Amino acid sequence: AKQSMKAREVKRVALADKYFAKRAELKAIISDVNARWNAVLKLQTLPRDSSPSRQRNRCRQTGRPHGFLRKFGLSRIKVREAAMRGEIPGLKKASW
Template sequence: MAKESMIQREAKRNKLINKHQVKRRKIKQDIKKSNDFMSILQLQKQIQKLPRDSMKCRQRNRCWITGRSRGFYRDFGLSRHMVREMSHECLLPGVKKSSW
């Protein structure tokens, strides 16, 4: 189980990403359209004023049950431990234990 503070920090980042997503996208489009160097600098200053945690690349994938960030399976949104436990209990449809 992950620390509660890490889970809360990730939730805060998700809120900031959703809040500033449209504004960030609009500024980036304006930068691509602009030809004037000074206007590009102004737009870059605007983007730098936005919070760091509002960038999508700072988001970390976490298991929705345990909050674990390592060993994350995107298909299920779970960590490897939970995928194993849930597949043994037949809670994940289409997942079989392999043997050869």
């Protein structure tokens, strides 16, 4: 969580919606056997604080960078806590 951190992460997100949003391949094709130079691969200093592998999740509701659920977005605490009330359609406590 920590607003100061949350925001610090938000940056790591927008950057993808820019550089990686398209220019990510603008050099990719020139990276794999598609002859083929190295200049682009060499002057490759565009994606720094930006990387499609440096973005964390953090409980959507809160912001815990652990115990995340793709199908949702929150962490065990919120999810369970919320599901209890019913902010999630069809999510009754499982018990085969």
